[PDB]
Please model this.
Amino acid sequence: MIQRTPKIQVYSRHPAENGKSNFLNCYVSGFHPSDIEVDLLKNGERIEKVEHSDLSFSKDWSFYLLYYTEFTPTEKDEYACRVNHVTLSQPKIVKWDRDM
Amino acid sequence: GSHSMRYFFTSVSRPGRGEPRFIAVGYVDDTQFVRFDSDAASQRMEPRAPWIEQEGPEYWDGETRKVKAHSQTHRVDLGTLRGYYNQSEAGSHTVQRMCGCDVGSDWRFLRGYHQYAYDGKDYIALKEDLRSWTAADMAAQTTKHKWEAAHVAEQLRAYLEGTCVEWLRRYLENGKETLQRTDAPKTHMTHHAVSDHEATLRCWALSFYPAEITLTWQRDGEDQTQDTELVETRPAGDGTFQKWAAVVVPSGQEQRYTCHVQHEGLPKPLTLRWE
Amino acid sequence: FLPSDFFPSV
Model:
């Protein structure tokens, strides 16, 4: 099998405004095989109520999923997406950058 | 404009115990409207858009019957493919299938397609003429001979040109309020100094639909690709999409650069400039 | 509206 490591974008559904409810998104794509572990973190801790989209795939057969949760951005709280996949030796952590 | 209806199937074998995981999703254009997940409790095809909910029990019974039958075909496939490829009973493998039809802006059939993959590589595909198959290797060649003997292309061409297009038309009508609405990208530019001498400009396209979009940077009216970055188009999670393109420029020269946005929802392309 | 289960197994 071809193993392909995930691309990861971490971003909000709406423009981030401190103190206002929003959705934090972690979009994983370009990966194969489909088995993948994705957590969203707040200050390094696993957020509990995280949902994801139904598995689907792109023209090149690589898979994509959207994981998401309601959150409230603030000046100080750090959000991140943590991903593990067979192609990775250890979980990859991508911090949410509100400019990206 | 043109429209499509597509189904995507994924089946993943579970060597240590039980049946494969099977997930199916149906789309009209970039809108997901149904799903089936073998692991879910319902064991039914489920709605994922409001406009499909008005279909009656017969519809849902029929979709459920078909999708479960499909899942069982992929189940047999995974077993045969392990044998074709002389693979251990120990490993997990994947089959993927995608099929669908397009209609043009007159809602008449434009094209149809079906592609099948094993472990993330092309395996067998219907040709654009809907009459014959492409096989990637000698395993798929065996499958091609089986599918030729069973006259599959003929049956699939029937679906693609008939019932696929007829139901796409029905959905487009019933779901008109969203499926025939175009959401032009909401665009703006942000500015991010990188040093005393350089700054990034980032051209944003937000809350658009459908997903197809082109963002281009120009400098003094010529396309620029060096010193740019373009992210993959990504889902907002409310059915719309987002994308951005960025360029690094010398501080003070921002006004030379323009971002150009093309999208079906835009009668003319938009041009953004930092001032 | 799905195609029916008309593909033979591979």
The helical segments of chain B are 57-84, 138-149, 152-161, 163-174, 176-179. The first helix of chain B runs from residue 57 to 84. Chain B has two domains: 1-181, 182-270.
